[PDB]
Amino acid sequence: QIHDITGKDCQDIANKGAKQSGLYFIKPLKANQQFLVYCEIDGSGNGWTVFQKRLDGSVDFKKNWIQYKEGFGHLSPTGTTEFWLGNEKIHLISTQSAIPYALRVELEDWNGRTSTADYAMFKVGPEADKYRLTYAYFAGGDAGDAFDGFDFGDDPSDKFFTSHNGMQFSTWDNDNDKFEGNCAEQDGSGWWMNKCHAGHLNGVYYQGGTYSKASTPNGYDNGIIWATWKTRWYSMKKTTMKIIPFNRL
Ligand SMILES: [Ca+2]
């Protein structure tokens, strides 16, 4: 169920001998109390700390500010459950000791194809700054750089409106986006919204992937999307968001 070795993150845990993916206790520099996390440990001693997982539509991602801050969903020793670790925990891990962390977004198709997109020097700010997302540069990956924004063709400033670097976090009850309306409320989720999005992994789980403007009454593109890999009308089968110290790349 839960393993004995502990550390500051899953890489530290892997550096101490553990070789099995599963549940572990970690305690980041500023964390006053230890908490449970799911570590993904591969054959090369890489230990990834997973903070978000989607795979079957068992959890509703339309949660409020406090829920996204504290975390929701279920942690499993088998890694077959959906959850959001919690913004406060993501903040404590990503900013401890100025250690440079890399974020890996892993996506899976309804056709079996998996893709990734890596971001160097990933960080999540404190609550005072509404858990802002910042990264140095896109490090590569076949899923493409959706965080850089995308020109959908709706408005000439589309790219400026869809980038995510520097965006604060938003939930329906705590709007901090760059939109006149409420992106989080219209979509029904919690995310780093701009004048909405180009990459949005906390959207509605549409079975089969393909959906349309007709699926929803207002026709919102509120699925689990990553514009640089698939159309805004295609919802992902599985997603994984995980972090590891930059030097492990
Ligand atoms: Ca707004």
PDB file of C-alpha atoms and ligand atoms in Angstrom:
ATOM      1  CA  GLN A   1       0.000   0.000   0.000  1.00  0.00           C
ATOM      2  CA  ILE A   2       2.425   2.705   1.266  1.00  0.00           C
ATOM      3  CA  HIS A   3       6.221   2.293   1.225  1.00  0.00           C
ATOM      4  CA  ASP A   4       8.819   3.053   3.961  1.00  0.00           C
ATOM      5  CA  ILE A   5      11.530   5.148   2.253  1.00  0.00           C
ATOM      6  CA  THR A   6      10.761   8.897   2.424  1.00  0.00           C
ATOM      7  CA  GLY A   7      12.290  12.068   0.945  1.00  0.00           C
ATOM      8  CA  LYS A   8      11.756  15.629  -0.366  1.00  0.00           C
ATOM      9  CA  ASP A   9      10.272  14.320  -3.621  1.00  0.00           C
ATOM     10  CA  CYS A  10      10.096  11.083  -5.642  1.00  0.00           C
ATOM     11  CA  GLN A  11      13.596  11.528  -7.127  1.00  0.00           C
ATOM     12  CA  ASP A  12      15.122  11.726  -3.650  1.00  0.00           C
ATOM     13  CA  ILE A  13      13.167   8.559  -2.843  1.00  0.00           C
ATOM     14  CA  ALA A  14      14.602   6.847  -5.946  1.00  0.00           C
ATOM     15  CA  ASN A  15      18.106   7.995  -4.926  1.00  0.00           C
ATOM     16  CA  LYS A  16      17.715   6.103  -1.651  1.00  0.00           C
ATOM     17  CA  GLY A  17      17.037   2.676  -3.159  1.00  0.00           C
ATOM     18  CA  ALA A  18      13.313   2.404  -3.971  1.00  0.00           C
ATOM     19  CA  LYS A  19      12.595   0.789  -7.351  1.00  0.00           C
ATOM     20  CA  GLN A  20       8.838   0.266  -7.206  1.00  0.00           C
ATOM     21  CA  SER A  21       6.228   2.769  -8.448  1.00  0.00           C
ATOM     22  CA  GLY A  22       3.578   3.252  -5.793  1.00  0.00           C
ATOM     23  CA  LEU A  23       2.541   5.349  -2.831  1.00  0.00           C
ATOM     24  CA  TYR A  24       5.172   7.108  -0.703  1.00  0.00           C
ATOM     25  CA  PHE A  25       5.380   9.819   1.920  1.00  0.00           C
ATOM     26  CA  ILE A  26       7.433  12.913   1.030  1.00  0.00           C
ATOM     27  CA  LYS A  27       8.063  16.124   2.968  1.00  0.00           C
ATOM     28  CA  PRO A  28       9.237  19.185   0.950  1.00  0.00           C
ATOM     29  CA  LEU A  29      11.446  21.840   2.600  1.00  0.00           C
ATOM     30  CA  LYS A  30       8.631  24.174   3.673  1.00  0.00           C
ATOM     31  CA  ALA A  31       5.959  21.497   4.190  1.00  0.00           C
ATOM     32  CA  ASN A  32       5.105  21.445   7.873  1.00  0.00           C
ATOM     33  CA  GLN A  33       3.630  17.940   7.581  1.00  0.00           C
ATOM     34  CA  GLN A  34       4.433  14.948   5.356  1.00  0.00           C
ATOM     35  CA  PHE A  35       1.879  13.935   2.730  1.00  0.00           C
ATOM     36  CA  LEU A  36       1.182  10.976   0.466  1.00  0.00           C
ATOM     37  CA  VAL A  37       2.066  11.031  -3.263  1.00  0.00           C
ATOM     38  CA  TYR A  38       2.284   8.591  -6.148  1.00  0.00           C
ATOM     39  CA  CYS A  39       5.840   8.062  -7.377  1.00  0.00           C
ATOM     40  CA  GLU A  40       6.554   6.703 -10.815  1.00  0.00           C
ATOM     41  CA  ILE A  41       9.985   4.996 -10.744  1.00  0.00           C
ATOM     42  CA  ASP A  42      11.480   3.658 -13.966  1.00  0.00           C
ATOM     43  CA  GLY A  43      14.334   1.308 -14.781  1.00  0.00           C
ATOM     44  CA  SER A  44      16.934   4.081 -14.890  1.00  0.00           C
ATOM     45  CA  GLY A  45      16.467   5.408 -11.365  1.00  0.00           C
ATOM     46  CA  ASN A  46      14.234   8.279 -12.494  1.00  0.00           C
ATOM     47  CA  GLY A  47      11.578   9.067  -9.885  1.00  0.00           C
ATOM     48  CA  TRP A  48       8.670  11.194 -11.153  1.00  0.00           C
ATOM     49  CA  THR A  49       6.248  12.873  -8.746  1.00  0.00           C
ATOM     50  CA  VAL A  50       2.726  12.689 -10.273  1.00  0.00           C
ATOM     51  CA  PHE A  51       0.325  15.574  -9.482  1.00  0.00           C
ATOM     52  CA  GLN A  52      -2.549  15.061 -11.972  1.00  0.00           C
ATOM     53  CA  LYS A  53      -3.994  11.958 -13.618  1.00  0.00           C
ATOM     54  CA  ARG A  54      -7.081  11.472 -15.881  1.00  0.00           C
ATOM     55  CA  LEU A  55      -8.045   8.037 -17.247  1.00  0.00           C
ATOM     56  CA  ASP A  56     -11.738   7.094 -17.037  1.00  0.00           C
ATOM     57  CA  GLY A  57     -14.040   9.979 -16.077  1.00  0.00           C
ATOM     58  CA  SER A  58     -14.590   8.764 -12.502  1.00  0.00           C
ATOM     59  CA  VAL A  59     -13.952  12.195 -10.910  1.00  0.00           C
ATOM     60  CA  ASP A  60     -15.673  15.527 -11.644  1.00  0.00           C
ATOM     61  CA  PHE A  61     -13.035  18.270 -12.125  1.00  0.00           C
ATOM     62  CA  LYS A  62     -15.484  21.102 -11.492  1.00  0.00           C
ATOM     63  CA  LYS A  63     -14.291  21.844  -7.974  1.00  0.00           C
ATOM     64  CA  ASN A  64     -13.934  25.141  -6.123  1.00  0.00           C
ATOM     65  CA  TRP A  65     -10.855  27.105  -4.967  1.00  0.00           C
ATOM     66  CA  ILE A  66     -10.295  25.307  -1.666  1.00  0.00           C
ATOM     67  CA  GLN A  67     -10.735  21.853  -3.271  1.00  0.00           C
ATOM     68  CA  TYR A  68      -8.166  22.590  -5.988  1.00  0.00           C
ATOM     69  CA  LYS A  69      -5.894  24.040  -3.311  1.00  0.00           C
ATOM     70  CA  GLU A  70      -6.149  21.026  -0.981  1.00  0.00           C
ATOM     71  CA  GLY A  71      -6.483  18.269  -3.596  1.00  0.00           C
ATOM     72  CA  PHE A  72      -9.213  15.800  -4.542  1.00  0.00           C
ATOM     73  CA  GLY A  73      -9.640  12.389  -6.179  1.00  0.00           C
ATOM     74  CA  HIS A  74      -8.113   9.079  -5.116  1.00  0.00           C
ATOM     75  CA  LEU A  75      -4.534   7.845  -4.750  1.00  0.00           C
ATOM     76  CA  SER A  76      -3.975   4.191  -5.645  1.00  0.00           C
ATOM     77  CA  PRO A  77      -0.967   1.901  -5.191  1.00  0.00           C
ATOM     78  CA  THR A  78      -1.647   0.641  -8.726  1.00  0.00           C
ATOM     79  CA  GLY A  79      -1.875   4.142 -10.254  1.00  0.00           C
ATOM     80  CA  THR A  80      -5.284   3.503 -11.789  1.00  0.00           C
ATOM     81  CA  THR A  81      -7.201   6.392 -10.186  1.00  0.00           C
ATOM     82  CA  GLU A  82      -7.879  10.062 -11.071  1.00  0.00           C
ATOM     83  CA  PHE A  83      -6.812  12.915  -8.800  1.00  0.00           C
ATOM     84  CA  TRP A  84      -5.463  16.489  -8.496  1.00  0.00           C
ATOM     85  CA  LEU A  85      -2.718  16.590  -5.851  1.00  0.00           C
ATOM     86  CA  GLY A  86      -3.594  20.096  -4.759  1.00  0.00           C
ATOM     87  CA  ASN A  87      -2.134  23.505  -5.647  1.00  0.00           C
ATOM     88  CA  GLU A  88      -0.517  24.091  -2.239  1.00  0.00           C
ATOM     89  CA  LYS A  89       1.372  20.771  -2.456  1.00  0.00           C
ATOM     90  CA  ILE A  90       2.378  21.428  -6.065  1.00  0.00           C
ATOM     91  CA  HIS A  91       3.712  24.808  -4.887  1.00  0.00           C
ATOM     92  CA  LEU A  92       5.790  23.342  -2.007  1.00  0.00           C
ATOM     93  CA  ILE A  93       7.405  20.696  -4.204  1.00  0.00           C
ATOM     94  CA  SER A  94       8.202  22.834  -7.279  1.00  0.00           C
ATOM     95  CA  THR A  95       9.782  25.709  -5.337  1.00  0.00           C
ATOM     96  CA  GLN A  96      11.850  23.958  -2.616  1.00  0.00           C
ATOM     97  CA  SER A  97      15.480  25.128  -2.437  1.00  0.00           C
ATOM     98  CA  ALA A  98      15.352  26.745  -5.887  1.00  0.00           C
ATOM     99  CA  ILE A  99      15.811  23.245  -7.282  1.00  0.00           C
ATOM    100  CA  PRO A 100      15.114  23.356 -11.022  1.00  0.00           C
ATOM    101  CA  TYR A 101      12.215  21.001 -11.926  1.00  0.00           C
ATOM    102  CA  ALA A 102      11.033  19.852 -15.354  1.00  0.00           C
ATOM    103  CA  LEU A 103       7.324  19.277 -16.071  1.00  0.00           C
ATOM    104  CA  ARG A 104       6.305  16.435 -18.363  1.00  0.00           C
ATOM    105  CA  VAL A 105       2.792  16.355 -19.816  1.00  0.00           C
ATOM    106  CA  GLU A 106       1.958  12.843 -21.064  1.00  0.00           C
ATOM    107  CA  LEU A 107      -1.122  12.366 -23.235  1.00  0.00           C
ATOM    108  CA  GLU A 108      -2.895   9.299 -24.557  1.00  0.00           C
ATOM    109  CA  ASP A 109      -5.134   8.945 -27.611  1.00  0.00           C
ATOM    110  CA  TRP A 110      -8.298   6.867 -27.951  1.00  0.00           C
ATOM    111  CA  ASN A 111      -6.218   5.056 -30.632  1.00  0.00           C
ATOM    112  CA  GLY A 112      -3.379   3.973 -28.338  1.00  0.00           C
ATOM    113  CA  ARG A 113      -0.894   6.725 -29.327  1.00  0.00           C
ATOM    114  CA  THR A 114       0.945   8.455 -26.470  1.00  0.00           C
ATOM    115  CA  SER A 115       2.805  11.799 -26.706  1.00  0.00           C
ATOM    116  CA  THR A 116       4.732  14.159 -24.404  1.00  0.00           C
ATOM    117  CA  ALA A 117       5.725  17.813 -23.997  1.00  0.00           C
ATOM    118  CA  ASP A 118       8.418  18.860 -21.494  1.00  0.00           C
ATOM    119  CA  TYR A 119       8.885  22.243 -19.817  1.00  0.00           C
ATOM    120  CA  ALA A 120      12.179  23.299 -18.205  1.00  0.00           C
ATOM    121  CA  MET A 121      12.269  25.119 -14.825  1.00  0.00           C
ATOM    122  CA  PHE A 122       8.593  24.615 -13.971  1.00  0.00           C
ATOM    123  CA  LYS A 123       7.226  26.409 -10.867  1.00  0.00           C
ATOM    124  CA  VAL A 124       3.891  27.143  -9.201  1.00  0.00           C
ATOM    125  CA  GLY A 125       3.694  30.280  -7.058  1.00  0.00           C
ATOM    126  CA  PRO A 126       2.064  30.770  -3.628  1.00  0.00           C
ATOM    127  CA  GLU A 127      -1.617  31.379  -2.876  1.00  0.00           C
ATOM    128  CA  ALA A 128      -0.935  35.082  -2.391  1.00  0.00           C
ATOM    129  CA  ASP A 129      -0.070  35.137  -6.106  1.00  0.00           C
ATOM    130  CA  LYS A 130      -2.991  32.813  -6.975  1.00  0.00           C
ATOM    131  CA  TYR A 131      -0.706  29.822  -7.693  1.00  0.00           C
ATOM    132  CA  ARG A 132       0.754  31.345 -10.847  1.00  0.00           C
ATOM    133  CA  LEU A 133       2.352  29.045 -13.430  1.00  0.00           C
ATOM    134  CA  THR A 134       5.838  29.936 -14.778  1.00  0.00           C
ATOM    135  CA  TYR A 135       8.460  28.082 -16.826  1.00  0.00           C
ATOM    136  CA  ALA A 136      11.691  29.047 -18.582  1.00  0.00           C
ATOM    137  CA  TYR A 137      11.296  27.358 -21.945  1.00  0.00           C
ATOM    138  CA  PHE A 138       9.669  24.452 -23.807  1.00  0.00           C
ATOM    139  CA  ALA A 139      12.154  21.559 -23.747  1.00  0.00           C
ATOM    140  CA  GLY A 140      10.635  19.504 -26.569  1.00  0.00           C
ATOM    141  CA  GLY A 141       8.218  16.657 -27.155  1.00  0.00           C
ATOM    142  CA  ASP A 142       5.915  15.325 -29.839  1.00  0.00           C
ATOM    143  CA  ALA A 143       2.755  16.789 -28.268  1.00  0.00           C
ATOM    144  CA  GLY A 144       3.991  20.263 -29.202  1.00  0.00           C
ATOM    145  CA  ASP A 145       4.057  23.467 -27.163  1.00  0.00           C
ATOM    146  CA  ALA A 146       0.386  24.300 -26.413  1.00  0.00           C
ATOM    147  CA  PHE A 147       1.353  26.468 -23.429  1.00  0.00           C
ATOM    148  CA  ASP A 148       2.868  28.961 -25.893  1.00  0.00           C
ATOM    149  CA  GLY A 149      -0.642  29.669 -27.210  1.00  0.00           C
ATOM    150  CA  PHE A 150      -2.385  28.799 -30.463  1.00  0.00           C
ATOM    151  CA  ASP A 151      -3.895  30.614 -33.423  1.00  0.00           C
ATOM    152  CA  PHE A 152      -7.328  29.031 -33.679  1.00  0.00           C
ATOM    153  CA  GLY A 153      -8.478  31.531 -36.287  1.00  0.00           C
ATOM    154  CA  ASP A 154     -11.302  32.963 -34.181  1.00  0.00           C
ATOM    155  CA  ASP A 155      -9.644  36.347 -33.554  1.00  0.00           C
ATOM    156  CA  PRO A 156      -6.368  37.850 -34.859  1.00  0.00           C
ATOM    157  CA  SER A 157      -4.937  37.943 -31.297  1.00  0.00           C
ATOM    158  CA  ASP A 158      -5.682  34.230 -30.650  1.00  0.00           C
ATOM    159  CA  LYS A 159      -2.089  33.334 -29.741  1.00  0.00           C
ATOM    160  CA  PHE A 160      -1.871  36.197 -27.259  1.00  0.00           C
ATOM    161  CA  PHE A 161      -5.184  35.056 -25.773  1.00  0.00           C
ATOM    162  CA  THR A 162      -4.309  31.332 -25.447  1.00  0.00           C
ATOM    163  CA  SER A 163      -0.758  31.216 -24.006  1.00  0.00           C
ATOM    164  CA  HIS A 164      -0.360  29.966 -20.423  1.00  0.00           C
ATOM    165  CA  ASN A 165       3.056  31.106 -19.131  1.00  0.00           C
ATOM    166  CA  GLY A 166       2.524  33.638 -16.369  1.00  0.00           C
ATOM    167  CA  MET A 167      -1.173  32.851 -15.902  1.00  0.00           C
ATOM    168  CA  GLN A 168      -2.738  32.736 -12.453  1.00  0.00           C
ATOM    169  CA  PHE A 169      -4.997  29.830 -11.430  1.00  0.00           C
ATOM    170  CA  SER A 170      -8.804  30.083 -11.771  1.00  0.00           C
ATOM    171  CA  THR A 171     -11.858  28.120 -10.536  1.00  0.00           C
ATOM    172  CA  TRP A 172     -15.531  29.144 -11.066  1.00  0.00           C
ATOM    173  CA  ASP A 173     -15.605  30.865  -7.644  1.00  0.00           C
ATOM    174  CA  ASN A 174     -12.216  32.618  -8.011  1.00  0.00           C
ATOM    175  CA  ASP A 175     -11.804  34.235 -11.405  1.00  0.00           C
ATOM    176  CA  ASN A 176      -8.249  35.400 -12.157  1.00  0.00           C
ATOM    177  CA  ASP A 177      -8.163  34.984 -15.928  1.00  0.00           C
ATOM    178  CA  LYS A 178      -7.746  37.613 -18.659  1.00  0.00           C
ATOM    179  CA  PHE A 179     -11.340  37.213 -19.931  1.00  0.00           C
ATOM    180  CA  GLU A 180     -14.320  39.559 -19.491  1.00  0.00           C
ATOM    181  CA  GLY A 181     -16.341  36.442 -18.704  1.00  0.00           C
ATOM    182  CA  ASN A 182     -15.414  33.493 -16.485  1.00  0.00           C
ATOM    183  CA  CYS A 183     -13.383  30.828 -18.319  1.00  0.00           C
ATOM    184  CA  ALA A 184     -13.412  28.350 -15.403  1.00  0.00           C
ATOM    185  CA  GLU A 185     -17.183  28.642 -14.967  1.00  0.00           C
ATOM    186  CA  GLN A 186     -18.052  28.363 -18.646  1.00  0.00           C
ATOM    187  CA  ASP A 187     -15.823  25.299 -18.968  1.00  0.00           C
ATOM    188  CA  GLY A 188     -16.539  23.872 -15.522  1.00  0.00           C
ATOM    189  CA  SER A 189     -13.001  23.313 -14.197  1.00  0.00           C
ATOM    190  CA  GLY A 190      -9.899  24.686 -12.471  1.00  0.00           C
ATOM    191  CA  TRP A 191      -6.905  25.763 -14.595  1.00  0.00           C
ATOM    192  CA  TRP A 192      -4.338  28.479 -15.521  1.00  0.00           C
ATOM    193  CA  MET A 193      -6.801  30.324 -17.772  1.00  0.00           C
ATOM    194  CA  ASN A 194      -5.938  33.223 -20.115  1.00  0.00           C
ATOM    195  CA  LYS A 195      -8.723  34.456 -22.441  1.00  0.00           C
ATOM    196  CA  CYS A 196      -9.213  30.829 -21.914  1.00  0.00           C
ATOM    197  CA  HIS A 197      -6.881  28.172 -23.410  1.00  0.00           C
ATOM    198  CA  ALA A 198      -4.802  26.226 -25.955  1.00  0.00           C
ATOM    199  CA  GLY A 199      -3.855  23.431 -23.505  1.00  0.00           C
ATOM    200  CA  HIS A 200      -6.480  22.367 -20.936  1.00  0.00           C
ATOM    201  CA  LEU A 201      -6.190  18.997 -19.180  1.00  0.00           C
ATOM    202  CA  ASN A 202      -8.871  19.494 -16.521  1.00  0.00           C
ATOM    203  CA  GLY A 203     -11.828  19.625 -18.937  1.00  0.00           C
ATOM    204  CA  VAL A 204     -14.897  17.415 -19.441  1.00  0.00           C
ATOM    205  CA  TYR A 205     -14.218  13.743 -20.153  1.00  0.00           C
ATOM    206  CA  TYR A 206     -15.899  13.019 -23.524  1.00  0.00           C
ATOM    207  CA  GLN A 207     -16.057   9.329 -24.251  1.00  0.00           C
ATOM    208  CA  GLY A 208     -14.627   8.406 -27.643  1.00  0.00           C
ATOM    209  CA  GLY A 209     -12.521  11.550 -27.960  1.00  0.00           C
ATOM    210  CA  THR A 210     -14.389  13.261 -30.800  1.00  0.00           C
ATOM    211  CA  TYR A 211     -17.051  15.826 -29.860  1.00  0.00           C
ATOM    212  CA  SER A 212     -18.495  18.990 -31.433  1.00  0.00           C
ATOM    213  CA  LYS A 213     -20.078  22.391 -31.022  1.00  0.00           C
ATOM    214  CA  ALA A 214     -23.371  20.445 -31.007  1.00  0.00           C
ATOM    215  CA  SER A 215     -22.401  18.310 -27.963  1.00  0.00           C
ATOM    216  CA  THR A 216     -22.878  21.228 -25.602  1.00  0.00           C
ATOM    217  CA  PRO A 217     -25.826  23.714 -25.483  1.00  0.00           C
ATOM    218  CA  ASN A 218     -23.490  26.735 -25.847  1.00  0.00           C
ATOM    219  CA  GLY A 219     -20.964  24.868 -27.995  1.00  0.00           C
ATOM    220  CA  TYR A 220     -17.912  25.379 -25.757  1.00  0.00           C
ATOM    221  CA  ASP A 221     -14.692  23.537 -26.540  1.00  0.00           C
ATOM    222  CA  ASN A 222     -14.471  22.392 -22.904  1.00  0.00           C
ATOM    223  CA  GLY A 223     -12.934  18.909 -23.326  1.00  0.00           C
ATOM    224  CA  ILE A 224      -9.446  17.661 -22.374  1.00  0.00           C
ATOM    225  CA  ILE A 225      -7.484  19.389 -25.169  1.00  0.00           C
ATOM    226  CA  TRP A 226      -3.915  20.031 -26.316  1.00  0.00           C
ATOM    227  CA  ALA A 227      -4.224  22.093 -29.508  1.00  0.00           C
ATOM    228  CA  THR A 228      -0.740  21.376 -30.849  1.00  0.00           C
ATOM    229  CA  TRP A 229      -1.421  17.613 -31.023  1.00  0.00           C
ATOM    230  CA  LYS A 230      -5.131  17.259 -31.724  1.00  0.00           C
ATOM    231  CA  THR A 231      -8.051  19.448 -32.728  1.00  0.00           C
ATOM    232  CA  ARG A 232      -9.903  21.455 -30.066  1.00  0.00           C
ATOM    233  CA  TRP A 233     -12.776  19.049 -30.839  1.00  0.00           C
ATOM    234  CA  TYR A 234     -10.855  15.997 -29.651  1.00  0.00           C
ATOM    235  CA  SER A 235     -10.800  15.007 -26.001  1.00  0.00           C
ATOM    236  CA  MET A 236      -7.898  12.926 -24.582  1.00  0.00           C
ATOM    237  CA  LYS A 237      -8.245   9.362 -23.212  1.00  0.00           C
ATOM    238  CA  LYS A 238      -5.616   9.805 -20.464  1.00  0.00           C
ATOM    239  CA  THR A 239      -3.360  12.582 -19.203  1.00  0.00           C
ATOM    240  CA  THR A 240      -0.478  12.650 -16.709  1.00  0.00           C
ATOM    241  CA  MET A 241       1.265  15.733 -15.296  1.00  0.00           C
ATOM    242  CA  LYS A 242       4.491  14.937 -13.439  1.00  0.00           C
ATOM    243  CA  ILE A 243       7.673  16.621 -12.240  1.00  0.00           C
ATOM    244  CA  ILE A 244      11.332  15.564 -11.831  1.00  0.00           C
ATOM    245  CA  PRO A 245      14.586  17.496 -11.157  1.00  0.00           C
ATOM    246  CA  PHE A 246      15.749  19.041 -14.460  1.00  0.00           C
ATOM    247  CA  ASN A 247      19.075  17.233 -14.490  1.00  0.00           C
ATOM    248  CA  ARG A 248      17.156  13.956 -14.954  1.00  0.00           C
ATOM    249  CA  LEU A 249      16.463  14.693 -18.660  1.00  0.00           C
TER     250      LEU A 249
HETATM  251 CA    CA B   1     -12.628  36.987 -15.932  1.00  0.00          CA
END
